[PDB]
C-alpha cells in the first residue's frame, strides 16, 4: 500500500504536500474562471438568439421554428443560471475550504514538531546538563572530605534523585519518538490524504454537474431540435396555395364577347356579290398568306419551347435538390417562351377563323354567277 | 382542381397575386435577417467559448474537457461560416429572383390586357364608326340620284367592302376573346403558380439546410459531448495521488531515538538504594496519578471522536452525492479530534512506560532492605 503516511513522512514530504495544496488551489481557481466564462457565454448566446425574434403551411412552419428558437434562447439562459447557482458556487466553497485546510494542516504539522523537539531534545538536554553539574558537585564534595561527610551524602542524595528523573525523562522521550514517527505524523498525513481523496470525489461531481447543466445535446435541447425538424418537414410545396385560393379565389371575370352589331346592316354575314367577289378572293389570298406566316411562327416557338424544356430536364437531372435556386432563371426563360407560343397560337387561330369564313362563302357560290346588285 | 388559373383569373385576382408576391418578399426578407442574426450569434458564441481557454487523472481529464470545449468553439464558428455561405446566400438569390419575377409577371399581364383592348375593342370601334359613315354616305348618294348613279355605285362598292372587313374584324376579335380567357391569361396564371410552388420547394430546402447546419444536437456536437462525459467519468478519486506519490515519495525520515548517555554514570537503570527508595515510591505514586488523568483524557477524546463519526455517518447518509462539499467542515472537525486523541494516546503511553520502570524496580526489591550506600 502507498500513501501520504508512508511516502511523505518527512520534512521533505511536508514541503511537497504544501506545494501540492497550492497547486491544487491554483488549478481549481482556473476551473472557476473557466466555468465563470461558460456562464457569461451561455447568457450572451441566449441574448444573441433572443434577438433573432397566415393559413399557409410555410407560414405556420416558419412560426413554429422561430418560436422554438426562442425556446432555445431561454434554455441557454437557464443553463447560465443553473451553472452559476450549482457547480460554480460549490467550486467556490471547495476553494474556501482548501484555503482554511492548508493553514490547519501546516500548523498541526508544526505543533507536532515543536512537541517532539521539546520532549525529545530540549528537556533531555536540560536533564543531561544538570546531571553533569551534580556529578561534578558530588566529585568535589567527595574530595573535600564531619561537616564534610554531611555535604557529600547530600551531594549523593541529589545526584541519585536527578539520575532517576533523567532515566524517566529518557523513557518518556523514547515513547514520544515512537508515537511521533509511527502514529502521530502518519495519522496526520493519512487524514490529509483522506480529505484530499474526498475532495477529488467532490470535484468529479462538480465537473459532471457542469457537463450535465451545460450540455447542448441533452434531452431538452434535442426535443427543441426535433420540433424544428418536424415543422420544416411538414412543408408541402404543392399544397402552399390551397388556403390562399380558398380565401381569395373567385369565378373568372369574362366581359361579354363582341358580336356583329345588326343595327348597321344575315347578321354578321359576308356580302358576296358582283361588286365584292374579286375583293373576297383577294382577302382569302392575303389571309391565307398571313396564316402560313403565323403557322410558321407557332412552329418555331414550339421548337423553342421544346429546346428549353429539354435543356431544363438535363439541368434538373444534374443539379442537387438543394441547389435548385440556380434553375430559376432558366425556368423564367421557359415561361416567357411558353407565353410567346400562346400569343402565336392566338394569332394563328384568329387568321384561321377568318379564312374559314372567306373560304366557306366562296365555296357556297361555287360555279354560280356572283349575284347582281339591283338598285330599287 | 383549384389553381391560380381558375381561381384568380380576373383583375381582382391579379391584385391579390400582386400583394401575394410582395407579402412573400417581406417574409423572405424577415427570414434572411433572422438567419443573419443566427450567423452573428454562433460566431460570437464561438468567440465567447474560445475565451474560456500533470500525471494525475483529474489533471488529464480536465485538459481533455477544456480541449473539447475549444473544439466546440471551432464547430460553432463553422456553423456560422456554413450558414452564411449556404442557405443565407441561397435565400438572397431567391429574393433577387422574386424581385425580377414580380416585374415580369405584371408586365406580361398588362401586355395581354393591351392586346385584348386593341383587338377586341379599339379596332372594333374604329370599324363600326367607319361603317356608319359609309352607310350615311351611301344613303345620301342613293337620295342624290348619270353622274349620280356613278357616285352611288361607288358608295355601295366601298360600303360593301367595309362591311366585309368589319365581319372579319369581328371574327378575329371573337377568337382573341376566346384565346385570352381560356388560354392566354390561364396559361400565364398557371406558370406563375408553377414558379411559386417550385419556390416553395426551394424555401423548404433552405430551411432544412439551415436546421442541419445550425443544429446543436447533430453528430459532431454529440461526439464532443461524449468525449467530455467519458473524460469526467474516468476520474478515480482513490487513484488521484498514485502518480504523485511515485514521483515525490520517499522513505520516512526518522532521526535517531534518544538513549541513556552512559558517559554520565547499569546503562539507563533506576538507582534503588537507601537514599532513593522513598523518592522512587513518591514518583510511582505521582506517575500513576498522572497516568489515571491521561487515561481519562484518552477515554474522553475517543468518545468525542465516536460522537463525531456517528454524526458524520448520519449526515453522509442524508446528503445527496453532489452536495458532499457541505460535509467538509465536519470532516475537518473530526480530523482535529482524531489528532487530539492521538496526542493523548502518546501522553498515556509515555506515563505508562515510566510507571512500568518504577513498578518493576520496586517489585524486584520486594521484601528486601534497600541497599546501603557505602562510601569507599
Three-state SS string across chain A, please?
Answer: CCCHHHHCCCHHHHHHHHHHHHHHHHHHHHHHHHHHHHHHHHHHHHHHHHHHCCCCHHHHHHHHHHHHHHHHHHHHHHHHHHHHHHHHHHHHHHHHHHHHHHHHHHHHHHHHHHHHHHHHHHHHHHHHHHHHHHHHHHHHHHHCCCHHHHHHHHHHHHHHHHHHHHHHHHHHHHHHHHHHHHHHHHHHHHHHHHHHHHHHHHHHHHHHHHHHHHCCCCHHHHHHHHHHHHHHHHCCHHHCCHHHHHHHCCCCCCCCCCCCCCCCCCCCCCCCCCCCHHHHHHHHHHHHHHHHHHHHHHHHHHHHHHHHHHHHHHHHHHCCCCCHHHHHHHHHHHHHHHHHHHHHHHHHHHHHHHHHHHHHHHHCCCCCCCCCCCCC
Q: Is residue A59 domain-shared with residue A136, that is, in the same domain? A: yes
For residue A242, what are the CA distances in angstroms to A58, A247, B32, B203? 12, 9, 25, 17
**Cα distance between residue A301 and residue A343, in whole Å:** 10
CA dihedral B100, B105, B109, B115 (to 10 degrees): 70
Place of cell 418578399: B25
| Positions of chain breaks in chain B, given as the residue before each break (C to N > 2.5 Å) | 53, 145, 265
Q: Could you say which of B7, B44, B97 has the minimum Cβ distance to residue A249? A: B7
Contact flag A52-B61 (C-beta cutoff 8 Å): no
Contacts by B227-234, CB closer than 8 A, 24 or more apart: B227/B64, B227/B68, B228/A211, B228/B64, B228/B65, B228/B68, B228/B69, B229/A208, B229/A211, B231/B60, B231/B61, B231/B64, B231/B65, B231/B68, B232/A204, B232/A207, B232/A208, B232/A211, B232/B61, B232/B65, B233/A208, B234/B57, B234/B61
Query: Do B218 and B212 form a contact (C-beta atoms < 8 A)?
Result: yes
Q: Report the 10 Å Cβ neighbour count for A120.
A: 22
Regarding whether A284 and A243 lie in a shared domain, the answer is no
Q: How many CB pairs under 8 A join A and B?
A: 456
In chain A, the N- to C-terminal Cα span, in Å, equals: 145
Taking only residues 97 to 136 of chain B, the set having a beta carbon closer than 8 angstroms to any beta carbon of chain A reads 97, 100-101, 104, 108, 115, 119-120, 124, 128, 131-132, 135
Give the three-state DSSP class for B218. coil
Put simply, the answer to whether A174 touches B353 (Cβ < 8 Å) is: yes
Q: Are residues B61 and B109 in the same domain?
A: yes
Q: Which residues of B touch A283 (CB under 8 A)?
A: 164, 168
Cα separation of A207 and A201, whole Å? 10
Do A34 and A90 lie in a common domain? yes
Give the Cα separation of B102 and B14 in Å (integer). Answer: 12
Distance CA A256, CA B352 (A): 132
DSSP SS3 for B3: coil
Residue of chain B whose alpha carbon sits nearest to that of A124: B258
Query: Which chain A residue shows the shortest CA-CA distance from B195?
Result: A331
Which residues lie below 8 Å from residue B107, measured CB to CB, with a gap of 6+?
Answer: none
Same domain, B308 and B350: yes
Q: Which of residues 138-177 of B touch A (CB under 8 A)?
A: 149, 152-153, 156-157, 160-161, 163-164, 166-168, 170-177
Contact A94 B325 (CB under 8 A): yes
Q: Does residue B262 fall inside a structural domain?
A: no
- The torsion angles phi and psi of A64, rounded to 5 degrees, stand at -60, -40
Residues of A with CB below 8 A from B322's CB? 90, 205-206, 209
Angle between helices B147-179 and A277-318 (to 10 degrees): 20
**Backbone torsions φ then ψ of A257, nearest 5 degrees:** -80, 135
Burial A21-53 (b: 16+ CB within 10 A, else e): beebbeebeebbebbbbbbebbbbbbebbbebe
Grid coordinates standing for B338?
482524531
Pick the closest to residue B305 from B337, B344, B270 (CA basis).
B337
In the stretch 280-309 of chain A, residues with CB closer than 8 A to chain B read 280, 283, 287
Distance, CA of B320 to CA of B324 (rounded, Å): 7
Q: How far apart are CA B47 and CA A105, in angstroms?
A: 42
Cell of B103: 416585374
Final residue of a structural domain among A203, A234, A250: A250
Identify whether A191 is part of a domain.
Answer: yes
**Residues of chain B neighbouring A321 (CB-CB closer than 8 A):** 205
Rounded Cα–Cα distance for residues A37 and A305 (Å):
62
A270, B164: Cβ pair inside 8 Å? yes
Q: How many Å apart are CA B3 and CA B194, to the nearest integer?
A: 10
> Which residues of chain A lie closer than 8 angstroms to B355, CB-CB?
none
Claim to verify: residue B141 and residue B210 sit in the same structural domain: yes
Overall domain count for chain A: 2
Instruction: With respect to residue A258, please indicate whether it lies within any of the assigned structural domains.
Output: no
Residue B268 lies in a domain: no
Q: Is B40 a domain residue?
A: yes
User: In this structure, what C-alpha cell is assigned to residue B132?
Assistant: 356608319
C-alpha grid cell, residue B162 = 367595309
Its domain, for residue B357, covers: 274-367
Task: State the Cα–Cα distance between residues B114 and B80, nearest whole angstrom.
Answer: 50
Chain A residues close to B136, C-beta within 8 Å: none
Cα dihedral sign, A145-A151-A156-A162: negative
**In chain B, which residues have their Cβ closer than 8 Å to the Cβ of A183?**
342, 345-346
**Nearest CA of chain B to the CA of A337: how many Å?**
11
Other beta carbons within 10 Å of A177: 19
Chain A partners of B8 at a C-beta cutoff of 8 Å? 245, 248-250
* CATH at residue B309: 1.10.287.160
CB A330 within 8 A of CB A311: yes
CB atoms B170 and A335 under 8 Å: no
B284, B199: one domain = no
**Contact yes or no for B158/A279 (Cβ under 8 A):** no
Contact A88, A11 (CB under 8 A): no
**In a shared domain, residues B82 and B164:** yes
Binary contact (A205, B324; C-beta < 8 A): yes
Half-sphere exposure of A295 (CA within 13 A, CB side): 8
CB A329 within 8 A of CB B198: no
Q: Do residue A268 and residue B167 have CB atoms under 8 angstroms apart?
A: yes
The grid coordinates listed for A92 are 467556490
Task: Give domain status of residue B77, yes or no.
Answer: yes
User: What is the rounded distance in angstroms from the CA atom of residue B375 to the CA atom of residue A148?
Assistant: 13
Q: Which residues of B153-167 are buried (b: 16+ CB within 10 A; e: fewer)?
A: eebbeebbbbbbebb
Listed residue (A234, A262, A274, A272) closest to A358, CA to CA = A272
Q: In this structure, are residues A284 and A353 in contact, taking their beta carbons and an 8 Å threshold?
A: no
Whether the CB of B312 is below 8 Å from some CB of chain A: the reply is no
CA distance A174 to chain B (A): 6
* Backbone torsion region of residue A366, taken as left when φ is above 0, otherwise alpha when ψ lies between -120 and 50, otherwise beta: left
Interface test with chain A among B65, B79, B114, B328, by most A beta carbons within 10 Å:
B328
Residue A178 · residue B347 · CB < 8 Å: no
CATH code, B5? 1.20.1270.60
CB neighbours of residue A59 within 10 Å? 17
- Asked whether residue B261 is domain-assigned, the answer is no
Query: How many angstroms separate the Cα of A349 from the Cα of each of A191, B112, B179, B225?
Result: 106, 16, 8, 71
Which of B199, B216, B250 marks a domain boundary? B250
Cell of A56: 399557409
- Let me know whether A208 and A246 are in one domain: yes
Given B58, B120, B342, which is nearest A258 (Cβ)? B120
| DSSP reduced 3-state for B53 | coil
Q: What are phi and psi of B319, to 5 degrees?
A: -110, 140
- Give the three-class secondary structure for B261: coil
A212 lies in the same domain as A286: no
Q: Is residue B312 part of a domain?
A: yes
Tell me, yes or no, whether A212 and A313 share the same domain: no
Distances (CA, A) of B267 to A158, A161, B271: 19, 16, 11
Based on the number of CB atoms within 10 Å of its own CB, is A254 exposed (0-12), middle (13-18) or buried (19 or more)?
middle
Distance from CA of A311 to the nearest CA of B (A): 17
CB contact under 8 A, A171 and B7: no
Q: CB contact, 8 Å: B343 with chain A?
A: yes
Say yes or no: A220 and A327 in one domain.
no
Amino acid at each position: 500500500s502507498m500513501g501520504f503516511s508512508s511516502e511523505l513522512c518527512s520534512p521533505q514530504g511536508h514541503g511537497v504536500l504544501q506545494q501540492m495544496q497550492e497547486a491544487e488551489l491554483r488549478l481549481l481557481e482556473g476551473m472557476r474562471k473557466w466555468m465563470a466564462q461558460r456562464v457569461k457565454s451561455d447568457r450572451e448566446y441566449a441574448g444573441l438568439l433572443h434577438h433573432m425574434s397566415p393559413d399557409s403551411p410555410i407560414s405556420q412552419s416558419w412560426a413554429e421554428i422561430t418560436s422554438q428558437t426562442e425556446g432555445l434562447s431561454r434554455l441557454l439562459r437557464q443553463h447560465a443560471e443553473d451553472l452559476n447557482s450549482g457547480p460554480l458556487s460549490k467550486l467556490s466553497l471547495l476553494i474556501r475550504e482548501r484555503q482554511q485546510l492548508r493553514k490547519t494542516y501546516s500548523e498541526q504539522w508544526q505543533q507536532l514538531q515543536q512537541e517532539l523537539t521539546k520532549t525529545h531534545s530540549q528537556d533531555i538536554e536540560k536533564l543531561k546538563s544538570q546531571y553533569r553539574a551534580l556529578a561534578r558537585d558530588s566529585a568535589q564534595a567527595k574530595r573535600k572530605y564531619d561537616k564534610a561527610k554531611d555535604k557529600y551524602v547530600r551531594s549523593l542524595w541529589k545526584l541519585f534523585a536527578h539520575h532517576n528523573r533523567y532515566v524517566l525523562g529518557v523513557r518518556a522521550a523514547q515513547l514520544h519518538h515512537q508515537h511521533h514517527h509511527q502514529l502521530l505524523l502518519p495519522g496526520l498525513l493519512r487524514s490529509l490524504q483522506d480529505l484530499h481523496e474526498e475532495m477529488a470525489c467532490i470535484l468529479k461531481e462538480i465537473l459532471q454537474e457542469y457537463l450535465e447543466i451545460s450540455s447542448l445535446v441533452q434531452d431538452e435541447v434535442v426535443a427543441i431540435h426535433r420540433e424544428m425538424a418536424a415543422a420544416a418537414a411538414r412543408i408541402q410545396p404543392e399544397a402552399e396555395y390551397q388556403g390562399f385560393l380558398r380565401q381569395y379565389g373567385s369565378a373568372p371575370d369574362v366581359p361579354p364577347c363582341v358580336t356583329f352589331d345588326e343595327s348597321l346592316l344575315e347578321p354578321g354575314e359576308l356580302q358576296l356579290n358582283e361588286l365584292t367577289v374579286e375583293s373576297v378572293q383577294h382577302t382569302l389570298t392575303s389571309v391565307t398568306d398571313e396564316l402560313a406566316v403565323a403557322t410558321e411562327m407557332v412552329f418555331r416557338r414550339q421548337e423553342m419551347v421544346t429546346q428549353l424544356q429539354q435543356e431544363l430536364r438535363n439541368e434538373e437531372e444534374n443539379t442537387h435538390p438543394r441547389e435548385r435556386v440556380q434553375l430559376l432563371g432558366k425556368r423564367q426563360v421557359l415561361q416567357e417562351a411558353l407565353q410567346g407560343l400562346q400569343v402565336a397560337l392566338c394569332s394563328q387561330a384568329k387568321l384561321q377563323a377568318q379564312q374559314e369564313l372567306l373560304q366557306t362563302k366562296l365555296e357556297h357560290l361555287g360555279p354560280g354567277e356572283p349575284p347582281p346588285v339591283l338598285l330599287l
